[PDB]
Amino acid sequence: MNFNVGVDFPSFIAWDGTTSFPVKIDGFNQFGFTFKVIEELTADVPFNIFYHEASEADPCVPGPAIRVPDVPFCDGVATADGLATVVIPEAVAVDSFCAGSVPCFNGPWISIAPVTVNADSAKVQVTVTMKGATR
Amino acid sequence: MNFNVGVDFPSFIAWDGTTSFPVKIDGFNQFGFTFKVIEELTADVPFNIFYHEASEADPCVPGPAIRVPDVPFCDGVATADGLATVVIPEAVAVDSFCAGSVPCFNGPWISIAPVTVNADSAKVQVTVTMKGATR
């Protein structure tokens, strides 16, 4: 039997290959990204993770982007600058996907965008999924 | 705590606003659509739901598009012509999303596209969410 999974685990676009979209995570209590590759890559593509806060002019519109800080785990060492980053390796096949998520929440808005906008960046897609809702 | 949902419930883009992308539902056992608006509409926008078979010349590539048939529910009636369809009403605000799914699987690939490619259809975004895998 098939289910209406979208009722419980909605999905929102975050990076369609040409533009980024802030995603509101305030109503939910978990989330995670999902990367897909549509063409053969030419070099490693790094990604930056940002978070926003409610604007003063409107309490339902994101403000400017604030870069997410790092959070070292019990094993391993902190990043060179203590800021989160994501790197898609060269070996990713066109018919596979990746998954990763941040350890901490921070503000109620999140976003993701590549470090550099080039032809290699246009070959990637990023999407965000939500866990159970709180309202 | 944050759970990294993307491992268990991957989500894929289906209609970014200017192009339709086939999604391979074969590897999973449930799925569902999710609709979101980015700008106000002017009239109801209908969507067509297809399924694709494996390509004859290459088993790893999707074949031609085939319209999904309707299955009457336990207590209702079939559509005008027995084919599944969806309509996004006018009352939908920008800060809202809609979810729905088909009752039967059919082919291994699925797809969705608007009936028309006018300016209204470009304001909607669609993605597909998958439930636990089987491989």
């Binding site: 990367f35 391993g76 989160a84 096949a93 996907f97 998954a99 | -």
Partner: peptide, 27 residues
């Protein structure tokens, strides 16, 4: 710092890597 998890592929092998068998030993 984030650790990515990736599946081998959506299909086990979209183009199955069917390979020749080892050549037969000498006479």
């Amino acid at each position: 710092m984030v650790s990515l998890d990736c599946r081998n592929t959506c299909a086990p092998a979209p183009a199955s890597r069917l390979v020749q068998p080892p050549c037969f030993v000498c006479r």
